[PDB]
Structures are given as C-alpha cells and as structure tokens.
Write a protein that binds this ligand. Structure first.
Ligand code: AL
Ligand code: AL
Length: 670
C-alpha cells in the first residue's frame, strides 16, 4: 500500500520526497505528485491519481463540492491554553503606532494568505462585507474581488484572477508574483508583505507573528473588531474568528485507513517532539517564508482523525459554511420539520396541508439524520427523546419547546422510565442477565440510557450485547444480538432493527409488543401499559391486553403494580423536547405556538388534525403529550435535562458513543 500525496510547490515536493525516503521500509509507503495548484490536486485525487492533500478550510469547502466530494479525514491540532484543539484564530495584524482601526481600513493596502482561504480571505472580506465597510449586496453587485479592489488601495492576494489591483502589492516576478505559492503567499508570506511595508494590514493567524518575528512581536498589534488595538499575544480576546483547522482530505473510500495509518506513524516518528532532522510539522521559526507550511502548517503540533460521519459542510460549521455560500449567491415563516420514517412523514404531510404550508416536511431514515439535517440548516426542528436531546445538544442544538404529560393547562415536567415484565414470572431487576430484553431504541432515555446506564454504573461493563441472551433494541448493529428479536417492517426490504416506526418493535409501544410477543422485560415509560390496554390500542396483538397482565420491576429487586410506577421506577426523567439551532429558537417557538393553538388537544381546529395523536406510535410527538411548554431562552441541554440525567448519560456514552456523537464531540474539541 502506497499513499500518493499531492504537493502544490517545488519546496513541498522536496519535503514530500524527503519523507518518502524516510518511510520506504514502512508497511505503508509514500509517493509524491506535484501539481500547479491545490485544485489540480483535488481533481487528481477525485480522479484516483493521488490520495490526499492538506487544505485550508476554504479549500476543504471547495474539495467537498460535487463532483469531487472529497472528505476531511485528518485535522491539524494547534496549541491552546484552554487545550490544544482543531481550530485556530484569524487575526488582522498591523504595525504598532499606525493608529488606524478596523473602521479605517478603506484606502489602506492589504496582504492576504490567498484567495478563498479562511484567515487570509473568507474571514476578513466576509467580515468587512457584513459590517458594510465593503459594499457588496450579493452576486448581482459584481464579483467579490471587484468590491475588494475598490475597498483597499492595493493588495497582495495570491490566487486572485479578476482584479489586477489585488496582485499589485505582491513580491516576485511579474508573471508568478501573484501565484498561490508565491513569496508573499501563506500566513508567513502575508506577514512579510506587512513587514516589508507592502501592506498596512496582514490577514493571518494567531501564531504568525511568533512564527516569523518572535523577538519583534512588540512592533506589531492586532486590529480588534470593536475598534481597539491590542498586543499580538492577545489574539484570544482580539480576533476576527475561530475557524476549523486545515485538514487532509481524500476520497470517501477504503484507502482512508491507510492514509491515516501512514500519518499516525509519520507523526509518531517525526512529530513535534522528534529529535530527528526531519520535522513533519515545520518546525516553526524564522526562515524563508517560501519554506514554511510545507505539506502541513508549521504551527500544527499533531494530526487528529476526523470521525467518519463528517463531511466538509459539517466540518466547517453552519456559520462559516453559510458565510462562504453567501459570497456565491445573491440578494422563513415556515417550519421545516424533520420526520423519521414514512409514518411520521405522512402525519407531517397532513400537518403541512392543514397548516396551509406554515409547516413543511423532510424525511430521513433515522433520528440521527434529523440532527444532522438541522445542524446544516436543511431542516429546522424535530422532537427528540431526552437521550437524543443530549446528543443534539453536544451537536450545538438547543431545546426550545418541551412536552408536558400531566394536564394541558399546565404548560416541573417529566415522565418515569420503568421496567415491564409479564405478571406471571420470577423476572426481577437482579436476574435480568441472560434474559430477553425489549428497548424503545438505543440512545433513548427509558428504553436504553436509564436501564443500561444503571447496569453500566453498578456493573462497570460496556458489553451490553452479551448481558441479555438477546433482545430488540432498534438502532443496534444489524448482526448484533440486540437485534435478534426485532421484526423489521414485515415488508421488503425487511428493515429489521431500524430505529424508526418501520421497525415493529420500535418506540415505547413497540417495546411493549416485543414483551408480549417475545421478551422477558420491556424498558418503556410509566404510561405505556396504560396507553395500550383498555382497548385503547386496536392492534391484533394488544386489542385484548389487560393492565393486570403486567408488573413493574423495581431496583431493589421487588415487583409492583403498573400503577405504582411512582414507587417503582428506574428513574424520573426529563420530557421529550423540540431542538433547533440557537438562531432559529425565536421563529420556531412562535410558529409552533400558533400551531398548537389550532391543533393542540384543545385546538380550535382539532377536528382537522391533532398534533399530539397518532396510531399508538408517538409520531412526531409523544401520544402522551397534553401540551408544549416554552423552554426559557438560553437554556442549555444540560440545564434542560437536569444534572441527574446528564451525569447518567455522560458516563454511559464513554462505553460506545455513536457515530454522530463522536462526530459532534470532535466539533466540540473532544
Ligand atoms: Al488557514
Ligand atoms: Al422517551
């Protein structure tokens, strides 16, 4: 196995070949391919001519677009007091004593790392446009380069292809001084452009001055957004943005592992603390800027694997991604709801019709897809079980409206997680090992987090697939034993163990059925037996079920009547809630509030549609819901869930965090 690395300059090619020589005997070898620009590299990689290249976030964006669709597999790590993470700070450095502020940039000369790059372009230009300093309303007001050439008197923007003015301050030969790999390119080139007097300001990163003139830091200052000027070491409190680290992108195929193994071993051997003559990263320090940031930035102290569920859009984040897109586009009162499965989509489509369109619908196969869609902005909201509200929270979404189950006029609030078993049996909370279990779904409060967290806490084990002989816990690996009792849709394809209403044993009611049809214990909520007895459920399996046919399993090992859940429950837990992106909270609460007035349990038009009712399947909202109560603005997911639940799920997630949780933890720095 050989990794074909794509370089975009002769110096990079030289370093790459140097690394090739140093790893010729390794299990995974290295090959070097030099191209004219990073874009030729993106194309080469997509075309299976090369395998990887490290890119600035602005280029990670380009590489992730169709038809390339490359993905970030490794991210640079930079030193941080708070803790080295995979992000850096874009700063605007000027020479001390020049007095002008961020508000006086019009008419000044500027130095940039390169066109389309985070710190050197996307951040500074996007910011000046946002503040209105650079007049640009969108694509129809002309190109961004034209608006920038009109703003700054002259600049050096490696890679600029429309405005000659943006190359005017660049150093070098007439035909190549404006190339993306020219003398004044990169964070270090842009800095020297400033140092040489060719720019009044250089848009670089927080380590730049230290990398090029540590002993002369005192001759520079940072331009803060509030108009102030501060010392270069104050970047944490005087920066224009915190942006995702440069990352190695590659095709979304099997070769990603070998690419990572090569890097992992390469950095173990020539990492930041290596005594070797060869440094994978830099090392940082004074030297010809043309020799800096080769292959990887000199400021990187390590590479970190990027969770597989990550794509370029998620990697960059909604705000930055949206900023880039806005500079490529021109020139609301409807909620884009996320429905999991065909059943939820049908109820949602119906809601769309009676809401006259105030609510729109998007379908996905799994709940986790809703979290991803909302993170990207493709969808606006979704109701999630507390367990998922946690994951959604780690992902940056917040709970804005929550379900209440007691009285509709009551909109604290909660429900109880219980263990249900057949009345006539010895099954108890202490002899559960080796038994058949039924779970609403993995990751959910009552069906998984509470029961399993309780077992993990007391036992210390994480191997849950072997604790129960077998059972059904939707969302588990298809061939796992916790999927053996699941039934799928009964159609084709089977869709067995899928975490949606398509799975016969999915949800609170689904797990009860599984108990009646195949299990020894069901992990549901306090009202589940109630909701499906007394003929309230006309399904063949439950049309004749009786409340007294079941019993609750208390933690002490004893058993009780299903109506004494308050004295025999695994835990009292936070209710399900509607999560959204913070900026959307305002609109979603308002639109959701007007909807409940028309279609709530006492809706003025409840005869047309009822938000809180479904065929015993908790579609979109729990069937138990009596009303939604507003979650105070600014409430974090931890505050909403309560410290008790938070502590439980926090610990349990150390066992086997899902792909999405790992992905969002990465985004959070973990
Ligand atoms: Al950068
Ligand atoms: Al629940």
């Amino acid at each position: 196995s050989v990794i074909r690395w794509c370089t975009i300059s002769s110096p990079e090619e030289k370093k790459c070949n140097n690394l090739r020589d140093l790893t010729q005997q390794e299990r995974i070898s290295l090959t070097c391919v030099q191209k004219a620009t990073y874009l030729d590299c993106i194309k080469a990689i997509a075309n299976n001519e090369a395998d990887a290249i490290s890119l600035d976030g602005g280029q990670v964006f380009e590489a992730g677009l169709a038809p390339y669709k490359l993905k970030p597999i490794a991210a640079e790590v930079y030193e941080h007091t708070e803790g080295s993470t995979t992000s850096y700070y874009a700063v605007a450095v000027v020479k001390k004593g020049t007095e002008f502020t961020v508000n006086d940039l019009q008419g000044k000369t500027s130095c940039h790392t390169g066109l389309g790059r985070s710190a050197g372009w996307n951040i500074p230009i996007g910011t000046l446009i946002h503040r209105g300093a650079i007049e640009w309303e969108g694509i129809e007001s002309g190109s961004v380069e034209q608006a920038v050439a009109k703003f700054f008197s002259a600049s050096c923007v490696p890679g600029a292809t429309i405005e000659q003015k943006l190359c005017r301050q660049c150093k070098g030969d007439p035909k190549t001084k404006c190339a993306r790999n020219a003398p004044y390119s990169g964070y270090s080139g842009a800095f020297h452009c400033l140092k040489d007097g060719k720019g009044d300001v250089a848009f670089v990163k927080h380590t730049t001055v230290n990398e090029n003139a540590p002993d002369q830091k005192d001759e520079y200052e940072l331009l803060c957004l509030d108009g102030s000027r501060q010392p270069v070491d104050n970047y944490k409190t005087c920066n224009w943005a915190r942006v995702a680290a440069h990352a190695v992108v590659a095709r979304d195929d099997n070769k990603v592992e070998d690419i990572w193994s090569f890097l992992s071993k390469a950095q173990s051997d020539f990492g930041v603390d290596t005594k070797s003559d060869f440094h994978l990263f830099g090392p940082p320090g004074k030297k010809d800027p043309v020799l800096k940031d080769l292959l990887f930035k000199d400021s990187a102290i390590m590479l970190k694997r990027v969770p597989s569920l990550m794509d370029s859009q998620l990697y960059l984040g909604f705000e930055y991604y949206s900023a880039i897109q806005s500079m490529r586009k021109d020139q609301e009162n409807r909620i884009q709801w996320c429905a999991v499965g065909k059943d939820e989509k049908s109820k949602c489509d119906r809601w769309s019709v009676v809401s006259n369109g105030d609510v729109e619908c998007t379908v996905v196969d799994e709940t986790k897809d809703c979290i991803i869609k909302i993170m990207k902005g493709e969808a606006d909201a979704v109701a999630l079980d507390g367990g998922l509200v946690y994951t959604a929270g780690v992902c940056g979404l917040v709970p804005v409206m929550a379900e209440r189950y007691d009285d509709e006029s009551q909109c604290p609030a909660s429900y109880f997680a219980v263990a249900v078993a057949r009345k006539d049996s010895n099954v108890n909370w202490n002899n559960l090992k080796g038994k058949k279990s039924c779970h609403t779904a993995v990751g959910r409060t009552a069906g998984w987090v509470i029961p399993m967290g309780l077992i993990h806490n007391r036992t210390g084990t994480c191997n849950f697939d072997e604790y129960f002989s077998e059972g059904c816990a939707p969302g588990s690996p298809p061939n796992s034993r916790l999927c053996q009792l699941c039934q799928g849709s009964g159609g084709i394809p089977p869709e067995k163990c899928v975490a949606s209403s398509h799975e016969k044993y999915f949800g609170y009611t689904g797990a009860l059925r599984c108990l009646v049809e195949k299990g020894d214990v069901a992990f549901i909520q306090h009202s589940t037996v109630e909701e499906n007895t007394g003929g309230k459920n006309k399904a063949d399996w439950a049309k004749n079920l009786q409340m007294d046919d079941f019993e609750l399993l208390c933690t002490d090992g004893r058993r009780a009547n299903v109506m004494d859940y308050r004295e025999c429950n695994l835990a009292e837990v936070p209710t399900h809630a509607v999560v959204v992106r913070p900026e959307k909270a305002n609109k979603i609460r308002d639109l959701l509030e007007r909807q409940e007035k028309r279609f709530g349990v006492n809706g003025s038009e409840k005869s047309k549609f009822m938000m809180f009712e479904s065929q015993n399947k908790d579609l979109l909202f729990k069937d138990l819901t009596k009303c939604l109560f507003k979650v105070r603005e600014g409430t974090t997911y931890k505050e909403f869930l309560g410290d008790k639940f938070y502590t439980v799920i926090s610990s349990l997630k150390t066992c086997n965090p899902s792909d999405i949780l790992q992905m969002c933890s990465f985004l959070e720095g973990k």
